[PDB]
């Protein structure tokens, strides 16, 4: 079971 | 009295003391095994006129049923008893015949290849016989013997007759692989390879293990086929699949170029219907030689994330939908690059295009990320091109939801596959993977089954057992034997399609990996999840890659580099250590211990025999034979349970007695970070890719539901540490 809730403000900092 | 019946069907009187002797023999050296316990359980099932074979099966099973974590040595008690019964079953006595007599008899019966008798003399077979150690059969575990008997030993599948024993298998595989070697070195290699395989240092694939020595020549297990955008290429691809699945190979299909539904019908070739219909045609080709159209024969189809039909393609194995929009019996690999991930991070949109409408885009996606971004942004604004815009968060969540619910929606990071690889992306780009996502080789589309200008990738595999070496310098000998034996195999096997022969002879690509990694980590006191094994992993994978390149380099000196060596990055003096993802520097500080610059020079001057050498694959059967943890994965538990016709098969992890608290079981890991870092460190040195898994346990999350945030965070971490592909997603059934 998955909870489809994505926080784009939290992911934005990530450095690829 | 208790009468016993024999093989010819003749009656003798029961001899309980003889039985006890065998039990006593088998028990020699084992701890915590009760012979009485085994006798009590088996004697009660005896009856007047019971055949002798049935007595053997009864005591075997009795011992097998006592296998447990508390008394793991029953594994060997049952195995020895099983070996004993198989000896009598094949030779009529415990002592195996002389090698020469055995080979003569088997060649006359049509069970062994006749070249064996042409290639070696009777004196040479007599010499080989002195190498054999039949007592090495007493070192297998019960589960191992069951696999040997079930799918390795030469036998009559109809009558149930077994014709050989493990040591003749090992010696003759060696004899065949090095048969074309000069007589001055031939038997020295034969002996060394036999010692390596019979003492579990090197593991060989199933097809080799059951075929080499017999009259067949079909040994290919993975073929990579690339399909062009046309009816002729669609038909060629389809024909090639049917030929290869009839020989039991796993297929990896790249169907990304097929134009989207609606695009301009071009040339009579009704491509107005799009991808789905053709995907259904590949599925029936893959299952063409499968029992009842569903079992046996497998494939993984690849496509780019920006394809115009991606939303229909992503739900093809969804088990809820009309049959006309579902291709459930194939696995799919989605192809992503850095640009796509960036759009997700910034909360922007992704533009979908049909490959036929955007000149240069598809090729740029694999070979040049700068050119991809240039073309991609251009075409986004070009109003003449047919396109569609979707929210990156929506697309990524749709993909991840399908990956999570089926477990079989894979990821391939195409940029990582071409910026850090053995091949020059301008000449021979890597555009797809195989069935289990660890192979990464160049391919070219066919216009006809026999088109000689196409290229189908094939890869020969094998693995090093990390639990059977004492120090890392043992890999020097092992790498020589592994490379030489597999390179010989490339010339020994048959090629049904011209294009497959081209790639094998042109590039001579190999894929050697490891088994028993978990055991190795446990005996060095490290774990997967906390970062404690980073430096040891770095040091271990540097030795493997170093010695594999050394052996290949030595081989090119002797016999010449592979014909298409000039298409590799190795040809230009570029090494794995020069192109790895720089972020790795922050998570490992181990120094290089071998002379890479001396090797750099040697490669440049003498070249390499093989274009690729390493790949980390999954392994179930190989690991079972040596009682080892599978590939690089943590065990799911201390005891493995498998079903069989004879009963329940149990196998205890290696050295459970002393390392039970050192192991770190699959569901004890708090998350995927530790494991994903180890895969990144392994990928610094590996030529191809690794079959990395992602694991999630619902009971570790609020309300028993894995958050999409966590799924996308682990996807990005994988990308950050240079992970090229992602295989299964395991979700717990608890």
XYZ file of C-alpha atoms in Angstrom:
750
model
C 0.000 0.000 0.000
C 1.342 3.441 -0.904
C 0.512 6.972 0.220
C 0.632 9.178 -2.882
C 1.699 12.457 -1.269
C 4.713 14.202 -2.786
C 6.342 17.270 -1.255
C 8.198 18.983 -4.112
C 9.574 21.676 -1.779
C 11.397 18.984 0.213
C 12.893 17.238 -2.817
C 14.109 20.451 -4.489
C 17.251 20.761 -2.341
C 18.584 17.339 -3.366
C 21.797 17.438 -5.386
C 22.050 14.878 -8.210
C 12.396 -61.711 8.915
C 11.738 -58.622 6.806
C 12.443 -59.542 3.189
C 14.317 -57.119 0.933
C 13.853 -56.934 -2.866
C 16.708 -55.902 -5.194
C 17.296 -54.208 -8.556
C 16.853 -57.391 -10.612
C 13.779 -58.041 -8.445
C 15.281 -60.787 -6.279
C 14.715 -61.437 -2.582
C 17.343 -61.344 0.163
C 16.927 -61.101 3.965
C 17.090 -57.723 5.747
C 20.502 -56.779 7.160
C 20.038 -53.983 9.714
C 23.754 -53.880 10.620
C 24.741 -53.033 7.038
C 22.368 -50.046 7.132
C 23.837 -48.831 10.449
C 27.368 -49.026 9.024
C 26.445 -46.663 6.176
C 24.801 -44.285 8.668
C 27.906 -44.411 10.874
C 30.103 -43.706 7.843
C 28.034 -40.705 6.720
C 28.029 -39.240 10.240
C 31.831 -39.214 10.484
C 33.005 -35.756 11.523
C 29.542 -34.233 12.021
C 28.254 -32.716 15.263
C 24.861 -32.950 16.956
C 23.485 -35.662 14.664
C 21.814 -38.722 16.158
C 22.134 -41.954 14.187
C 19.538 -43.569 16.465
C 17.084 -40.757 15.755
C 17.452 -41.448 12.024
C 17.116 -45.222 12.513
C 13.949 -44.935 14.615
C 12.176 -42.775 12.005
C 13.094 -44.962 9.010
C 12.842 -48.501 10.378
C 9.143 -48.053 11.230
C 8.364 -47.499 7.531
C 10.044 -50.723 6.380
C 7.942 -53.709 5.299
C 8.335 -57.212 3.853
C 9.628 -57.104 0.277
C 10.646 -53.432 0.221
C 13.053 -52.660 -2.632
C 16.599 -51.648 -1.670
C 16.349 -48.282 -3.430
C 13.320 -47.487 -1.258
C 15.359 -48.151 1.898
C 17.920 -45.623 0.677
C 15.247 -43.000 -0.031
C 13.663 -43.563 3.391
C 16.874 -43.018 5.399
C 17.854 -40.072 3.168
C 14.541 -38.345 3.837
C 14.675 -39.219 7.536
C 17.971 -37.340 7.862
C 16.692 -34.548 5.596
C 13.639 -33.976 7.825
C 15.883 -33.259 10.845
C 17.721 -30.328 9.178
C 17.391 -27.277 11.435
C 19.257 -24.245 12.808
C 19.964 -26.231 15.984
C 21.516 -29.134 14.039
C 22.752 -27.940 10.648
C 25.095 -30.920 10.199
C 22.112 -33.067 9.140
C 22.560 -31.236 5.809
C 25.746 -33.226 5.263
C 24.412 -36.466 6.794
C 21.577 -36.506 4.260
C 23.885 -35.383 1.432
C 26.436 -38.134 1.956
C 23.639 -40.720 2.110
C 22.257 -39.239 -1.120
C 25.709 -39.307 -2.769
C 26.081 -42.964 -1.781
C 22.706 -43.859 -3.318
C 23.529 -41.984 -6.533
C 26.882 -43.795 -6.827
C 25.185 -47.184 -6.624
C 22.454 -45.927 -8.973
C 24.977 -45.046 -11.725
C 27.911 -47.432 -11.325
C 26.331 -50.326 -9.390
C 29.018 -49.900 -6.709
C 30.357 -46.984 -4.640
C 33.687 -46.717 -6.447
C 33.450 -44.891 -9.754
C 35.013 -46.530 -12.806
C 38.234 -45.252 -14.365
C 37.761 -42.030 -16.343
C 38.763 -43.580 -19.682
C 36.303 -46.482 -19.424
C 33.528 -44.118 -18.315
C 34.061 -41.743 -21.259
C 34.247 -44.635 -23.759
C 30.954 -46.105 -22.548
C 29.192 -42.720 -22.541
C 30.393 -41.843 -26.053
C 29.069 -45.174 -27.348
C 25.656 -44.514 -25.785
C 25.412 -41.072 -27.413
C 25.480 -39.212 -24.090
C 28.911 -37.585 -24.396
C 30.379 -35.737 -27.387
C 32.634 -37.909 -29.550
C 35.255 -35.140 -29.902
C 36.440 -35.978 -26.353
C 37.910 -39.240 -27.669
C 39.449 -37.508 -30.701
C 40.870 -34.576 -28.758
C 42.573 -36.525 -25.937
C 44.518 -39.791 -25.952
C 43.988 -42.731 -23.584
C 47.234 -41.832 -21.772
C 45.940 -38.276 -21.273
C 42.671 -39.587 -19.802
C 44.761 -41.782 -17.466
C 46.631 -38.661 -16.363
C 43.384 -36.769 -15.821
C 42.093 -39.628 -13.645
C 44.939 -38.975 -11.167
C 43.671 -35.385 -10.737
C 40.138 -36.388 -9.811
C 39.280 -36.584 -6.125
C 35.989 -38.478 -5.744
C 35.962 -37.750 -1.997
C 35.073 -34.132 -2.863
C 31.484 -35.388 -3.385
C 31.314 -35.711 0.434
C 31.491 -31.901 0.769
C 28.147 -31.022 -0.858
C 25.053 -30.127 1.226
C 21.687 -31.890 0.855
C 20.119 -29.050 -1.143
C 23.180 -29.007 -3.437
C 22.910 -32.748 -4.205
C 19.202 -32.256 -5.029
C 20.098 -29.596 -7.636
C 22.920 -31.750 -9.065
C 20.593 -34.735 -9.435
C 17.747 -32.565 -10.697
C 19.395 -30.501 -13.425
C 23.167 -31.037 -13.792
C 24.101 -34.736 -13.895
C 23.713 -36.489 -17.247
C 20.616 -38.672 -17.086
C 17.732 -40.345 -18.877
C 14.759 -38.095 -18.049
C 12.232 -40.783 -19.073
C 13.694 -43.805 -17.251
C 15.163 -41.866 -14.310
C 18.667 -43.268 -14.801
C 21.655 -41.181 -13.691
C 24.841 -41.854 -15.664
C 27.538 -39.811 -13.918
C 28.773 -38.273 -10.682
C 29.809 -34.722 -9.792
C 33.595 -35.173 -10.246
C 33.296 -36.518 -13.816
C 31.157 -33.461 -14.610
C 33.780 -31.080 -13.277
C 36.759 -32.789 -14.911
C 35.083 -33.105 -18.320
C 33.798 -29.504 -18.373
C 37.440 -28.492 -17.907
C 38.609 -31.004 -20.513
C 36.190 -29.583 -23.106
C 36.796 -25.875 -22.440
C 40.600 -26.166 -22.739
C 40.637 -28.849 -25.448
C 42.137 -26.550 -28.111
C 45.135 -25.585 -25.942
C 48.703 -26.474 -26.894
C 49.708 -29.874 -25.488
C 52.562 -28.329 -23.454
C 50.088 -26.425 -21.240
C 46.704 -28.118 -21.888
C 46.543 -30.518 -18.888
C 48.090 -28.003 -16.453
C 45.115 -25.719 -17.114
C 42.688 -28.658 -17.007
C 43.900 -29.571 -13.508
C 43.812 -25.997 -12.186
C 40.293 -25.281 -13.488
C 39.024 -28.612 -12.122
C 40.468 -27.745 -8.697
C 38.826 -24.310 -8.797
C 35.347 -25.590 -9.721
C 35.332 -28.747 -7.554
C 36.294 -26.788 -4.409
C 33.620 -24.131 -5.039
C 35.876 -21.141 -5.841
C 34.309 -20.473 -9.259
C 30.621 -20.987 -10.091
C 29.361 -21.677 -13.613
C 25.920 -21.060 -15.100
C 23.337 -23.831 -15.408
C 23.506 -24.258 -19.196
C 27.294 -24.834 -19.121
C 27.069 -27.148 -16.103
C 24.536 -29.444 -17.800
C 25.664 -29.236 -21.455
C 29.435 -28.886 -21.915
C 30.625 -32.466 -22.467
C 27.382 -33.577 -24.155
C 26.680 -33.430 -27.908
C 24.841 -30.064 -27.771
C 26.329 -26.628 -28.483
C 23.539 -24.351 -27.229
C 24.862 -22.421 -24.197
C 23.513 -18.843 -24.606
C 21.245 -17.614 -21.785
C 20.948 -13.851 -22.495
C 20.330 -12.146 -25.791
C 19.732 -8.443 -26.179
C 17.711 -7.499 -29.253
C 17.123 -3.940 -30.512
C 14.075 -3.325 -32.704
C 13.878 -0.608 -35.355
C 10.816 1.438 -36.358
C 9.538 -0.664 -39.266
C 7.579 -3.780 -40.247
C 10.715 -5.492 -41.554
C 12.553 -4.897 -38.278
C 9.501 -5.803 -36.208
C 9.372 -9.132 -38.069
C 13.134 -9.730 -37.734
C 13.010 -9.044 -33.997
C 10.026 -11.377 -33.650
C 11.711 -14.176 -35.637
C 14.903 -13.790 -33.572
C 12.943 -14.126 -30.295
C 11.247 -17.353 -31.403
C 14.603 -18.912 -32.337
C 16.178 -17.930 -29.008
C 13.314 -18.805 -26.633
C 13.190 -22.314 -28.136
C 16.725 -22.722 -26.717
C 15.602 -21.420 -23.314
C 17.203 -17.947 -23.324
C 16.119 -14.870 -21.342
C 15.358 -11.993 -23.740
C 15.931 -8.234 -23.354
C 13.997 -6.216 -25.976
C 14.447 -2.526 -26.803
C 11.230 -1.364 -28.498
C 11.653 2.337 -27.743
C 11.934 3.490 -31.368
C 8.485 2.208 -32.470
C 6.478 5.337 -33.321
C 3.428 6.415 -31.313
C -0.261 5.845 -31.969
C -1.564 8.328 -34.529
C 1.772 9.347 -36.064
C 1.952 9.644 -39.846
C 1.490 6.259 -41.514
C 4.781 6.012 -43.421
C 5.413 3.556 -46.224
C 2.343 1.284 -46.117
C 3.508 0.109 -42.687
C 0.357 0.731 -40.647
C 2.002 2.305 -37.597
C -1.200 4.241 -36.956
C -2.024 1.729 -34.211
C 1.115 2.377 -32.168
C 3.131 0.308 -29.728
C 0.657 -1.911 -27.845
C -0.314 -4.231 -30.722
C 3.378 -4.854 -31.496
C 4.176 -5.396 -27.793
C 1.449 -8.093 -27.767
C 3.140 -9.698 -30.796
C 6.493 -9.785 -28.934
C 4.788 -11.400 -25.905
C 3.365 -14.239 -28.020
C 6.823 -14.715 -29.608
C 8.420 -14.903 -26.134
C 5.857 -17.484 -25.000
C 5.823 -19.367 -28.313
C 7.648 -22.385 -26.857
C 6.023 -22.224 -23.406
C 3.851 -25.048 -22.053
C 0.376 -23.492 -22.095
C 1.291 -20.030 -23.386
C 2.347 -18.631 -19.987
C 5.101 -20.691 -18.310
C 8.768 -20.715 -19.334
C 10.471 -18.132 -21.618
C 10.843 -14.620 -20.188
C 11.560 -11.070 -21.388
C 11.991 -7.437 -20.277
C 10.974 -4.684 -22.736
C 12.590 -1.218 -22.529
C 11.290 2.231 -23.526
C 12.169 5.876 -22.883
C 10.276 7.849 -20.218
C 9.347 10.605 -22.725
C 7.671 8.338 -25.307
C 4.278 9.770 -26.290
C 2.491 6.572 -25.139
C 4.337 6.275 -21.791
C 1.113 6.557 -19.736
C -0.417 3.532 -21.505
C 2.897 1.674 -21.455
C 3.381 2.154 -17.686
C 0.147 0.289 -16.803
C 0.552 -2.656 -19.173
C 0.838 -5.201 -16.334
C -1.889 -3.591 -14.237
C -4.241 -6.512 -13.452
C -7.346 -4.322 -13.805
C -8.224 -3.278 -17.357
C -9.492 -4.452 -20.741
C -7.506 -7.334 -22.269
C -6.854 -5.232 -25.396
C -4.713 -2.762 -23.421
C -2.737 -5.191 -21.254
C 0.530 -7.059 -21.911
C 0.923 -8.682 -18.483
C 3.476 -11.451 -19.066
C 6.588 -9.346 -19.745
C 8.536 -7.038 -17.413
C 9.338 -3.433 -18.442
C 12.368 -1.169 -17.917
C 11.763 2.601 -17.962
C 14.647 4.700 -19.325
C 15.476 7.921 -17.479
C 18.289 10.500 -17.617
C 19.290 13.573 -15.573
C 16.958 16.026 -17.360
C 13.899 13.983 -16.406
C 14.989 13.913 -12.729
C 15.600 17.682 -12.771
C 12.048 18.379 -13.988
C 10.776 16.377 -10.989
C 12.954 18.272 -8.493
C 11.862 21.670 -9.836
C 8.170 20.688 -10.046
C 8.038 21.318 -13.799
C 6.455 19.393 -16.669
C 7.828 16.637 -18.881
C 7.139 16.792 -22.628
C 6.173 13.565 -24.387
C 7.182 13.014 -28.022
C 6.966 10.225 -30.597
C 10.492 9.197 -31.613
C 9.659 9.512 -35.334
C 8.834 13.226 -35.037
C 12.011 14.480 -33.275
C 15.133 14.099 -35.398
C 18.277 13.308 -33.397
C 16.551 13.129 -29.992
C 16.533 9.345 -29.402
C 20.252 8.884 -30.168
C 21.193 11.945 -28.074
C 19.350 10.442 -25.080
C 22.021 7.716 -24.797
C 25.168 9.253 -26.307
C 25.198 12.993 -25.507
C 23.323 14.643 -22.651
C 24.293 18.158 -23.763
C 22.885 17.536 -27.237
C 19.788 15.894 -25.693
C 18.995 19.003 -23.637
C 19.621 21.227 -26.666
C 17.294 19.259 -28.938
C 14.749 18.613 -26.170
C 14.232 22.302 -25.337
C 14.169 23.235 -29.026
C 11.423 20.700 -29.869
C 9.382 21.728 -26.795
C 8.917 25.183 -28.322
C 8.615 24.012 -31.954
C 4.863 24.205 -32.605
C 4.960 21.928 -35.677
C 5.877 18.888 -33.564
C 3.110 16.761 -32.056
C 3.584 16.669 -28.283
C 1.953 16.318 -24.878
C 2.813 17.883 -21.512
C 2.543 16.067 -18.172
C 3.431 17.045 -14.617
C 6.736 15.361 -13.693
C 5.365 14.483 -10.221
C 2.388 12.764 -11.853
C 4.493 10.710 -14.271
C 7.026 9.713 -11.605
C 4.265 8.674 -9.177
C 2.437 6.652 -11.827
C 5.645 4.767 -12.603
C 6.548 4.206 -8.931
C 3.023 3.065 -8.034
C 3.161 0.416 -10.774
C 6.692 -0.577 -9.718
C 5.506 -0.923 -6.117
C 2.354 -2.931 -6.885
C 3.879 -5.378 -9.382
C 7.530 -5.313 -8.308
C 8.527 -5.676 -11.973
C 8.716 -2.136 -13.369
C 12.462 -1.498 -13.628
C 14.598 1.623 -14.018
C 17.563 2.266 -16.307
C 19.649 5.433 -15.964
C 20.858 5.801 -19.563
C 23.282 8.653 -18.863
C 25.144 6.635 -16.203
C 25.258 3.679 -18.629
C 27.151 5.766 -21.193
C 29.242 8.251 -19.194
C 30.725 5.470 -17.040
C 31.246 2.506 -19.368
C 33.716 0.420 -21.363
C 32.246 1.709 -24.662
C 32.573 4.963 -26.589
C 29.034 6.348 -26.894
C 29.765 7.933 -30.278
C 30.555 4.535 -31.830
C 28.841 1.927 -29.650
C 26.335 3.335 -27.165
C 24.546 1.233 -24.551
C 20.819 1.499 -25.251
C 19.160 -1.214 -23.133
C 19.736 -3.999 -20.586
C 18.794 -7.705 -20.332
C 16.163 -9.737 -18.455
C 17.560 -9.224 -14.932
C 19.031 -5.754 -15.527
C 22.773 -6.443 -15.084
C 24.005 -6.715 -18.702
C 24.808 -3.525 -20.636
C 26.078 -4.080 -24.180
C 25.831 -2.308 -27.542
C 23.189 -3.391 -30.091
C 22.050 -2.657 -33.658
C 18.596 -3.229 -35.203
C 18.075 -5.935 -37.832
C 16.100 -5.545 -41.067
C 15.840 -9.321 -41.518
C 16.516 -12.434 -39.403
C 19.740 -13.066 -41.373
C 20.784 -9.418 -41.753
C 24.574 -9.410 -41.286
C 24.706 -5.685 -40.503
C 22.681 -5.982 -37.286
C 24.031 -6.709 -33.805
C 22.538 -8.861 -31.045
C 24.313 -8.787 -27.678
C 25.026 -12.031 -25.839
C 26.888 -12.478 -22.583
C 28.686 -15.434 -21.021
C 28.554 -15.438 -17.229
C 30.240 -16.939 -14.178
C 31.057 -15.914 -10.621
C 33.659 -15.871 -7.867
C 32.658 -17.397 -4.508
C 33.819 -14.809 -1.950
C 33.452 -17.314 0.932
C 36.000 -19.784 -0.469
C 39.055 -17.496 -0.797
C 41.384 -16.712 2.126
C 42.906 -13.496 0.816
C 42.188 -11.222 -2.151
C 45.364 -12.225 -4.022
C 43.807 -15.634 -4.707
C 41.731 -13.786 -7.323
C 44.770 -13.572 -9.634
C 44.707 -17.322 -10.395
C 40.906 -17.447 -10.346
C 40.596 -14.539 -12.801
C 42.999 -16.259 -15.227
C 41.012 -19.516 -15.187
C 37.616 -17.785 -15.378
C 38.585 -15.536 -18.317
C 40.384 -18.262 -20.292
C 37.629 -20.850 -19.878
C 34.808 -18.485 -20.873
C 36.762 -17.037 -23.845
C 37.255 -20.603 -25.130
C 33.498 -21.134 -24.767
C 32.809 -18.192 -27.125
C 34.450 -20.193 -29.941
C 32.890 -23.504 -28.867
C 29.174 -22.624 -28.951
C 26.777 -22.206 -31.863
C 25.109 -19.029 -33.122
C 21.667 -19.467 -34.715
C 21.472 -15.846 -35.937
C 24.298 -14.082 -37.820
C 23.935 -10.840 -35.830
C 24.512 -12.699 -32.528
C 27.743 -14.202 -33.886
C 28.892 -10.725 -34.945
C 28.689 -9.219 -31.448
C 30.237 -12.279 -29.785
C 33.208 -12.475 -32.166
C 33.600 -8.693 -32.491
C 33.611 -7.744 -28.802
C 34.008 -11.075 -26.924
C 32.023 -9.769 -23.925
C 32.005 -11.495 -20.538
C 30.124 -11.004 -17.265
C 31.829 -12.405 -14.157
C 30.285 -11.583 -10.768
C 30.216 -12.694 -7.136
C 28.216 -14.989 -4.831
C 28.373 -15.315 -1.007
C 28.779 -11.548 -0.405
C 26.665 -11.597 2.779
C 28.684 -14.459 4.275
C 31.879 -12.565 3.410
C 30.600 -9.444 5.202
C 29.478 -11.492 8.223
C 32.869 -13.144 8.731
C 34.604 -9.725 8.556
C 32.161 -8.353 11.125
C 30.451 -5.788 8.879
C 26.798 -5.151 7.995
C 24.867 -3.691 5.059
C 22.829 -0.843 6.562
C 25.207 1.347 8.628
C 28.070 2.181 6.246
C 30.491 -0.159 8.052
C 31.295 -2.188 4.896
C 31.955 0.696 2.472
C 35.787 0.581 2.610
C 35.988 -3.244 2.626
C 33.637 -3.346 -0.371
C 35.824 -0.764 -2.161
C 38.990 -2.761 -1.470
C 37.307 -6.033 -2.536
C 35.844 -4.764 -5.819
C 39.148 -3.083 -6.708
C 40.908 -6.471 -6.491
C 38.249 -8.233 -8.616
C 38.276 -5.649 -11.401
C 42.079 -5.318 -11.285
C 42.797 -9.051 -11.667
C 40.058 -9.560 -14.295
C 41.542 -6.821 -16.510
C 45.034 -8.240 -15.867
C 44.016 -11.750 -16.999
C 42.280 -10.378 -20.087
C 45.310 -8.213 -20.866
C 47.666 -11.194 -20.533
C 45.344 -13.168 -22.855
C 45.439 -10.480 -25.573
C 49.243 -10.584 -25.486
C 49.054 -14.325 -26.136
C 46.172 -14.510 -28.647
C 45.306 -10.983 -29.839
C 42.827 -8.358 -28.692
C 39.167 -8.626 -29.731
C 38.521 -7.385 -33.265
C 36.411 -4.382 -32.173
C 38.693 -3.374 -29.278
C 38.976 0.105 -30.859
C 35.344 0.934 -29.926
C 36.083 0.655 -26.192
C 37.127 3.457 -23.815
C 39.868 1.055 -22.668
C 41.448 1.448 -26.127
C 41.920 5.182 -25.401
C 43.598 4.583 -21.999
C 40.423 5.376 -20.009
C 39.686 3.201 -16.970
C 36.789 2.573 -14.587
C 38.610 4.620 -11.934
C 38.610 7.678 -14.269
C 34.872 7.893 -15.017
C 33.089 6.889 -11.796
C 30.479 9.211 -10.239
C 32.451 11.669 -8.088
C 29.910 11.745 -5.208
C 31.294 8.321 -4.172
C 34.353 10.113 -2.739
C 32.245 11.366 0.183
C 31.215 7.838 1.329
C 34.432 5.810 1.007
C 38.037 6.764 1.764
C 39.898 3.539 0.924
C 42.962 4.081 -1.284
C 43.750 2.100 -4.459
C 46.125 -0.764 -3.624
C 47.107 -1.971 -7.091
C 49.167 -0.372 -9.840
C 46.455 0.946 -12.174
C 48.887 3.160 -14.136
C 51.143 0.229 -15.036
C 47.979 -1.569 -16.195
C 46.705 1.512 -18.037
C 49.813 1.444 -20.236
C 49.658 -2.304 -20.867
C 46.008 -2.129 -21.956
C 46.781 0.750 -24.328
C 49.669 -1.176 -25.911
C 48.468 -4.807 -26.002
C 44.698 -4.283 -25.714
C 42.094 -6.535 -24.105
C 40.807 -9.946 -25.226
C 37.330 -9.108 -23.945
C 35.457 -5.792 -24.239
C 33.680 -6.219 -20.869
C 34.613 -8.467 -17.937
C 32.364 -7.911 -14.918
C 28.646 -7.861 -14.173
C 26.833 -8.566 -10.875
C 23.945 -10.974 -11.459
C 21.384 -12.725 -9.267
C 21.951 -16.440 -8.640
C 19.725 -19.109 -7.052
C 20.980 -22.463 -8.349
C 24.726 -21.761 -8.474
C 24.683 -20.518 -4.877
C 22.679 -23.584 -3.798
C 25.388 -25.954 -5.084
C 28.118 -24.291 -2.978
C 25.897 -23.535 0.029
C 26.355 -19.787 -0.431
C 24.262 -16.651 0.060
C 22.837 -15.536 -3.308
C 24.828 -12.995 -5.276
C 25.202 -9.824 -3.247
C 21.885 -10.037 -1.404
C 21.286 -10.487 2.301
C 19.526 -13.740 3.214
C 15.788 -13.532 3.977
C 16.316 -15.955 6.876
C 18.767 -18.436 8.442
C 16.970 -21.380 6.803
C 15.701 -21.587 3.208
C 12.677 -23.800 2.488
C 12.076 -25.095 -1.047
C 9.507 -27.584 -2.363
C 10.422 -30.790 -4.184
C 8.842 -34.044 -5.370
C 10.826 -35.945 -2.720
C 9.941 -33.539 0.101
C 10.776 -30.193 1.691
C 14.316 -28.974 0.993
C 16.000 -27.005 3.783
C 19.336 -25.185 3.622
C 21.071 -23.397 6.508
C 23.170 -20.280 5.851
C 26.912 -21.017 5.873
C 28.516 -21.233 9.318
C 25.288 -20.371 11.155
C 26.749 -21.940 14.305
C 29.398 -19.242 14.709
C 27.949 -16.316 12.731
C 24.231 -16.221 13.552
C 24.636 -12.848 15.318
C 26.975 -11.479 12.621
C 24.517 -11.873 9.737
C 22.095 -9.011 9.017
C 18.894 -10.482 7.556
C 16.941 -8.779 4.760
C 14.069 -7.444 6.921
C 16.363 -6.288 9.775
C 17.734 -3.467 7.647
C 16.120 -0.182 8.678
C 16.111 1.060 5.051
C 17.865 0.987 1.663
C 20.595 3.629 2.187
C 23.385 1.309 3.393
C 22.706 -1.216 0.631
C 22.413 1.480 -2.062
C 25.821 2.892 -1.028
C 27.442 -0.543 -1.387
C 25.966 -0.930 -4.881
C 27.368 2.507 -5.808
C 30.845 1.518 -4.564
C 30.650 -1.753 -6.506
C 29.606 0.152 -9.661
C 32.822 2.205 -9.578
C 34.729 -0.865 -10.800
C 32.134 -3.004 -12.657
C 32.143 -2.937 -16.467
C 28.409 -3.535 -16.856
C 25.712 -3.266 -14.194
C 24.354 -4.828 -10.986
C 20.922 -6.399 -10.257
C 20.109 -4.025 -7.356
C 16.913 -4.574 -5.382
C 14.900 -2.126 -3.262
C 13.086 -3.462 -0.166
C 10.172 -1.973 1.815
C 8.346 -3.208 4.935
C 4.861 -1.776 5.504
C 4.968 -2.336 9.282
C 7.807 0.205 9.624
C 5.505 2.965 8.332
C 2.523 4.799 9.813
C -0.734 3.027 8.913
C 1.114 0.228 7.079
C 1.606 2.247 3.887
C 4.851 3.076 2.123
C 4.986 6.799 1.447
C 5.609 7.925 -2.136
C 8.114 10.421 -0.667
C 10.279 7.536 0.574
C 10.041 5.726 -2.768
C 11.186 8.822 -4.698
C 13.906 9.652 -2.166
C 15.499 6.196 -2.628
C 15.242 6.536 -6.412
C 17.248 9.790 -6.228
C 19.835 8.399 -3.794
C 20.460 5.547 -6.237
C 20.991 8.103 -9.009
C 23.329 10.202 -6.830
C 25.761 7.342 -6.178
C 25.980 6.291 -9.827
C 23.663 3.252 -9.745
C 22.940 2.343 -13.375
C 19.826 0.135 -13.082
C 17.247 -1.033 -10.515
C 15.702 -4.518 -10.495
C 12.972 -6.010 -8.274
C 11.184 -4.074 -5.563
C 10.443 -6.444 -2.659
C 7.528 -5.574 -0.378
C 7.005 -7.643 2.760
C 4.117 -10.096 3.150
C 3.561 -9.217 6.805
